Amino acid sequence: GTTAKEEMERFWNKNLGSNRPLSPHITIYRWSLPMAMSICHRGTGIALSAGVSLFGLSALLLPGNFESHLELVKSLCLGPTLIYTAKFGIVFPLMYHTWNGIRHLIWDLGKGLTIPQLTQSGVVVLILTVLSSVGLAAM
Amino acid sequence: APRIKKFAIYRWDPDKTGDKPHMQTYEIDLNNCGPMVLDALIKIKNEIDSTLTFRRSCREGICGSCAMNINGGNTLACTRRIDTNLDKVSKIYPLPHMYVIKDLVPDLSNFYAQYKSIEPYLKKKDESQEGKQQYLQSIEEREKLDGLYECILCACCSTSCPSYWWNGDKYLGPAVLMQAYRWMIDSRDDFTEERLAKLQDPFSLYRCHTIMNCTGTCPKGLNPGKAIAEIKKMMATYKE
Amino acid sequence: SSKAASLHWTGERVVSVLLLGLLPAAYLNPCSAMDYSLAAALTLHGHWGIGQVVTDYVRGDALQKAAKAGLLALSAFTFAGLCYFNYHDVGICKAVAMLWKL
Amino acid sequence: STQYPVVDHEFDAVVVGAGGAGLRAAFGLSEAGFNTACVTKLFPTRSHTVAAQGGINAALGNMEEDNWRWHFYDTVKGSDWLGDQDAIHYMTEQAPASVVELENYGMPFSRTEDGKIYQRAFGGQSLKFGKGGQAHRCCCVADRTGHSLLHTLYGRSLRYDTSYFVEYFALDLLMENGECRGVIALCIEDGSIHRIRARNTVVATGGYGRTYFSCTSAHTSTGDGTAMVTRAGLPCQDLEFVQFHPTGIYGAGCLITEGCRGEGGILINSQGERFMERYAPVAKDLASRDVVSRSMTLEIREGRGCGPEKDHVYLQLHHLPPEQLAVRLPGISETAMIFAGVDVTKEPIPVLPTVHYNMGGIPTNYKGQVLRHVNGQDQVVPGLYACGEAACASVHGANRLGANSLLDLVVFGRACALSIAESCRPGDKVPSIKPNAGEESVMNLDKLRFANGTIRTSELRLSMQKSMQSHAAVFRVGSVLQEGCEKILRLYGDLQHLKTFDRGMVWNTDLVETLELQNLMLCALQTIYGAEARKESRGAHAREDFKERVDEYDYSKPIQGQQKKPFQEHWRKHTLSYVDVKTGKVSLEYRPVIDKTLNEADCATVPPAIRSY
Ligand SMILES: *Cc1cc2c(cc1C)nc1c(=O)[nH]c(=O)nc-1n2C[C@H](O)[C@H](O)[C@H](O)COP(=O)(O)OP(=O)(O)OC[C@H]1O[C@@H](n2cnc3c(N)ncnc32)[C@H](O)[C@@H]1O
Ligand code: HEM
Ligand SMILES: c1ccc2[nH]c(-c3cscn3)nc2c1
Ligand SMILES: O=C([O-])CC(=O)C(=O)O
Ligand code: SF4
Ligand code: F3S
Ligand code: FES
Secondary structure: OOOHHHHHHHHHHHHOOOOOOEOOOOOOOOOOHHHHHHHHHHHHHHHHHHHHHHHHHHHHHOOOOHHHHHHHHHOOOOOHHHHOHHHHHHHHHHHHHHHHHHHHHHHHHOOOOOOHHHHHHHHHHHHHHHHHHHHHHOO | OOOEEEEEEEEOOOOOOOOOOEEEEEEEEHHHOOOEHHHHHHHHHHHHOOOOOOOOOOOOOOOOOOOEEEOOEEEOOOOOEOOOOOOOEEEEEOOOOOEEEEOOEEOOHHHHHHHHHOOOOOOOOOOOOOOOOOOOOOHHHHHOOOOOOOOOOOOOOOOOOHHHHHHOOOOOOHHHHHHHHHHHOOOOOOOHHHHHHHHOOOOOOOOOOOOOHHHHHOOOOOOHHHHHHHHHHHHHHOOO | OOOHHHHHHHHHHHHHHHHHHHHHHHHOOOOOHHHHHHHHHHHHHHHHHHHHHHHHHOOOHHHHHHHHHHHHHHHHHHHHHHHHHHHHOOOHHHHHHHHHOO | OOOOOEEEEEEEEEEEOOOHHHHHHHHHHHHOOOOEEEEEOOOHHHOHHHHOOOOEEOOOOOOOOOOHHHHHHHHHHHOOOOOOHHHHHHHHHHHHHHHHHHHHHOOOOOEOOOOOEOEEEEEEEEOOOOOOOEEEEEEOOOOOHHHHHHHHHHHHHOOOOOEEEEOEEEEEEEEOOOOEEEEEEEEOOOOOEEEEEEEEEEEOOOOOHHHOOOEOOOOOOOOHHHHHHHOOOOOEEOOOOEEEEEEEEOOOOOEOOOHHHHOOOEEEOOOOOOOHHHHOOOOHHHOOHHHHHHHHHHHHHHOOOEOOOOOEEEEEOOOOOHHHHHHHOHHHHHHHHHHHOOOOOOOOEEEEEEEEEEOOEEEEOOOOEEEEEEOOEEEEEEEEEEOOOOEEOOOOOOOOOOOOHHHHHHHHHHHHHHHHHOOOOOOOOOOOOOOOOOHHHHHHHHHHHOOEOOEEHHHHHHHHHHHHHHHOOOEEOHHHHHHHHHHHHHHHHHHHHEEOOOOOOOOOHHHHHHHHHHHHHHHHHHHHHHHHHOOOOEOOEEEOOOOOOOOOOOOOOOOOOOOOOOHHHOOOEEEEEEEEOOOOEEEEEEEEOOOOOOOOOOOOOOOOOOOOO
16 A cells, blocks of 8 residues: 555655666657747747846946947948848747747637647748748838 | 568666667568567567567557657557658657666656546545446536547656656646546546645646647547646636 | 645736737837836746746756746846836837837 | 575455456455455556457346346356356346446446436347347447446556555465465566465456467466466366457457447448348347357358458448447547558458457356365365456356456456455464475576577467467367367477577566466467367357257257266366376366356246257
8 A cells, every 4th residue: 555645756766776767858759840839939938038138137237328329239330131130030039939929828728729720820820920020120 | 572671779778787778770571560560579579589678468559558759759559550661760769758677668657656646536525325326427428528538548648748858756747637637527526626726736737838749649649738728727717 | 725826827828918918009009107017017927937947947945946036036127127217218118119210 | 596585475365467357356355454465467557458348238227128137148048058157146136236336436438318327239138038139238438448447447446555566477376285375476677576475365367368379369368377276286167168259350350349230230241241140040240259250250161251362251330320430439440440441431341250258267156266176076265266357157158248258357356355355354364375485486487587498489479379270269170179289288398498588687578478478378288178178069169070069958859858968978067177287288177067046036047948049
C-alpha cells in the first residue's frame, strides 16, 4: 500500500540516485507549424516586454526629454528604406503576438482546437502578421 | 527480389560499465517483415540482436505498450507502418525527456503515480446502495464520454508536451488531465467540484499553454488539449 | 477552495482582452487617460506573462522566489516610468505619433 | 550461484495476474481486509483483457425479458457437456450482480433508451432454454468492452492498499508438502529475486495462446501459471480444448469481434453464398465458435477459398447502417483499416479462424480452489487458488460461449477472494518456507541467463508454433497428432541447446522470453498429447477418425433401455495432464464432469443431448 504522492517521491529518489540517461527531447522531436508558433509567441512576448521595459526604465534613468532624443535620432543617416526596415522589425514582433494572442483567446473559449483548424488558423495568423506589419511600417 | 531498410535505434545497457547513450544501425529485408515498425523491432530481436529491449504486448494498439519516438513523432510501433522508402533511415527513440531504464524502456512510475492522484474511479456521496442496481445514464449523457474513455494510457501525449518535459514532477500532463475531465463529465460521478478544486495550484493544470503537441501526436486519434481547455473553462466558472 | 489559480487565469484573459481593446482605442482617441490605461494594461499583462515564463523554467526555492522578487521590481520600475512619461513628458500616444512621422 | 540477492516478503495473500481476474481477486481480498500482494509481469492495463471487444454476459433483461437460468442452459449446451454444471450455476446466477458491480464501479457501458446497460446478440444464445429465439444479453462498452473493464477495475483497485509488484515475472510457486506457501519471482527492473510468501495464493495468469503460429492473443499469453502448476507436479485440465475464434484478420491475426455478427454481420465464401445459412439453418453465422470456424475451415478445403491465395473468407459488414457501424463497432472499423486497409462501410473484411482462447487450465472448484486427483477422487490443494483463462473450473467445457470469459474473470476473481475470506482470517500464521526454497528456479534462471547452445530462443519458439499450427489445428487425425506429439517431444529435448545473447540484470527480455518458452513448451506438450488421446469429437476438439460424441450413453435416443458405459470406456470426462519435467514425458488421467448443480430446485440439471445449431 503506497500513496500516489509516496510513489512520486520514490520515483525521484531512485532516478536521481541512478546513472540513467534522459531520452532526447527537442534535439530529436520533429517540428510542426503550431509547435514553432508557440515559442514564437513566447519570443514576441518576451521581446515586446523587454521593449516596453527598456522604454519605461530609460524614461526614469536617462536625462533629456523625448523630443530631444527624437532629434538625436534625426541627427543621423536615415535612409527612407532603413528607417522603414528599422521600424518594420518593431511592428513585426507586435503584430504576430497580437494576431496569435487572438487565436489563444479563441482557444480559451474552446473553439478551433482540432488539428485541421489549427494549421488553418496558424497560417491565417502568419499572413495577417505580414500584411499588418507592412501596412503599419508604410503608415 | 530483395528490398532493404535501415533502422537507427537508441541503445543503452545499464549492465555494461560506462556505457554511453548511442545509436545502433540494423538492416531488414522488408519482404521478410510485417508492415509495422514493431514487426521490424521484433524481427531484429528474433534474428539480428536480442540485446534489443522494448515493451510490447497486444501488437494491435490497445495495450499501450510500444509507445516510442518514431521519426520525431510519438506513436505506437504496432500501429505505425515503416516508410517503404528505402532511401530514408528510420529513427527510433525512447519517449522524450524520460529516464531510460534500458534501451527504449522508460521509467513511467511518475506517469502512473500521477494518474493515481486524480482518483480515476466513480465516486458517490452515498455508496451504501452500490452493487444493487445499474445506475441510469442517457445515451446523451453517455456521448459526453466518447473520445475520452478510449485513452490507453500510452503516454505519447504527456511525453511530447514540452511543459511536461520541464515540469514533469508537478505538472500532471495531457493524458492524466484528460482523464480527470473524463470523470468530471461522467454524469454518475458526484465529486465534480472537489475534482476541480484539486487543480487549484500554479502547476497541476496551469502549466498547459495550449502548445497542442498532445492532440497532434495521439496514436488513438484523441484530443487531450481540447479537454484541457474544457477543464480550464470549468475551473473559471464553477461555484465555491 | 481559495480559487487563486482559476481567478489569476481569468484575470489574465481579462487584461488580455482589455489590452487588445486599448490598441485601436488609443489610435482612434489619443488622449491622456488612454495613455495611463495603456500603461497599466501594458505592464500588468507583461508582468503576469513573464511570471509564467518564470514559474516554467526557474527551479527551486532559492531561484524561483528571487526571480519573482526581481520581476516585481522591474515591473514597478516599468509602470512608474510610463506614468512619469505620461505626466512630465509627451504621453505615449503622442510619443508614438511623433516617432512614426519620421 | 548466490550471485543473486534474495529478498523475502510476507503477506496474507498473493495474486499472480493483473488481468480482469487478477485485479478483481486482488482488491477483493484487500476489501475483505487482507494484506495482499499482486504480482504481474505487465502493467495491469497492458494485460490481455484490455484487447477484449465483444462484451460481458449477464441475464439483466434490458433488451427483452430474461432468466439467468436460460443463460445457464446456453452455457452448458455450448460446453458440449464437458462443462461442470455446479460452476456454471454459480457463474450464470452471479452474472447480473457482477455486471452491475462493474457499472456501479464506473464502467461506461453503451446505453439504451431507458439509459440502462445496452445488450446485444452473440453466438449461440437463446431465450426460454433454447426455444424462444435469439437472446440479447451481451453487455458492452461499444466495441472496447475489455479495454474499459480492465481500466475500470484498475481504476477501482487504486482505492485499496494492495502491495503491487509491477513488471515482476513469477517463476514458480513456493511449494511445501502439497501446500502452497507463496511465489518466487524475478524483478525485471533490476534482475533481483523475490520470495513473496502468503497463506494463500491465486493464479490468474491467463492463457497460453502463443503456443501457436497464428493467434489473436498478446505476446504475453505464455501459460506462465499453467507451467508453474505443472512444475509443481499438479494436474492441468482439458488442455487439448483450444478455441479457434471464427473471425480474425487474415494478416496479423488480430481479432474482429463476434459482436460484428450479433450486430447483423454476415459470412461469405468465394462465390458469395452465405455458407453459414446452410451449415447451421437455425442460428446461422450466430452459431457456436466451434461450429462456425469448423464450417469456415471446411469451406477452404471445399475449394471456396477467397483472396489471391484462396486461403481466407469474407466477413461482410458493408450492408449495415454506417451510424450503427460507428456507434456499435468503432474499434474494429479502425483496425480493419489499419491492418487490412479496409473501409467497413463499403467492403468485406478478410477473416480466418485463428487460435483465441484456452478452455483448459488449472483444475478448480466452483470456489476457485485448485484441485489435484488423488485416488480417482478430488482434493483441494491447501493455499492454492486459480481464476480466469488460467483456471479451469470448466465453466466453459469443450467450447466457450462468446462473452463468457470477461464474466468468468470477475465472477471467479471475486469467488477466490470470498473463499479465502470465508475460510481464514487476515493476520493469521503465514506458513514458513525453507531457506533453500525456490532454489532450482534460480538455478534454472542462471542456466538460461548464460545459455550458449546451438539453437536460439526465437528459432525454437517458431518451431513449436508452426508444429502446433499444422498438427493441432481445427481438424485433427491420430496420424498427424502422432507426428506432432513426437515432433514437440523432440523440441522439448532441444531446450538444453538454447542460445541466449543478453547477460544483464536489468530488463533482460532475452531471458524472460526464454523462461516464457520453457513455459509454453510444457503447455504445448500437454495440449498435443491430450489431443491425441481423446478419440472423439466433442466441442472444439474434432477428430476426423472419431467424429462421434462418446458419452456414458447414446443420448440420440432415450436412456434406461441402454446400458451405461464404465468410466474408462466413454469420453465424457476431464483430461488431467502431467509431465515429468526432465524427460518431457506426458502422462494423462481423467476425472468426471460435475452434473449436479448447486440446487436442483433453483436450477435443473441439463442432461446431455444432440447438439445442433
Ligand atoms: C485475444 C482476445 C480474447 C478475448 C477477446 C478479444 C481478443 C482479441 N474478447 C473477449 C470478449 O469480448 N469477451 C469475453 O468474454 N472474452 C474475450 N476474450 C477472452 C478473454 O479476454 C481472456 O480469456 C481474458 O481476458 C483473460 O484474462 P485474465 O484475467 O485471465 O488474464 P489476461 O488478461 O490474459 O492477462 C494475464 C495477466 O497475468 C499476468 N502474468 C502472466 N504471466 C505472468 C508471470 N510469469 N508472472 C507474473 N504475472 C504474469 C500478466 O501480467 C497479466 O496481467
Ligand atoms: C493587445 C495585444 C496582445 C494580446 C491580445 C496578447 C495576449 C497574450 C496571450 C493570450 C498570451 C499567452 C497566454 C496563454 O498561453 O494562453 C500572451 C503572452 C505574453 N504576452 Fe501578450 N498580448 C498582447 C500584446 C503584448 C504586449 C504589448 C506585451 C509586452 C508587455 C505582452 C507580453 C506577454 C508576455 C510576457 C507573455 C508571456 C509569453 C508566454 O508565457 O507564452 N503582450 N499574450
Ligand atoms: C517546443 C519546445 C518548447 C516550447 N515551449 C513552447 C511554449 C512555451 S509557452 C507557449 N509555447 N512551445 C514549445 C515548442
Ligand atoms: O472471446 C470473446 O468473447 C470474443 C470475441 O472474440 C469478441 O467478440 O470480441
Ligand atoms: S490521450 Fe492518446 S496519446 Fe495520450 S495517453 Fe491516451 S491514447 Fe496515449
Ligand atoms: S502538448 Fe501541452 S501544454 Fe497543453 S495543449 Fe498539449 S498539454
Ligand atoms: S503493443 Fe499493444 S500498443 Fe503496440
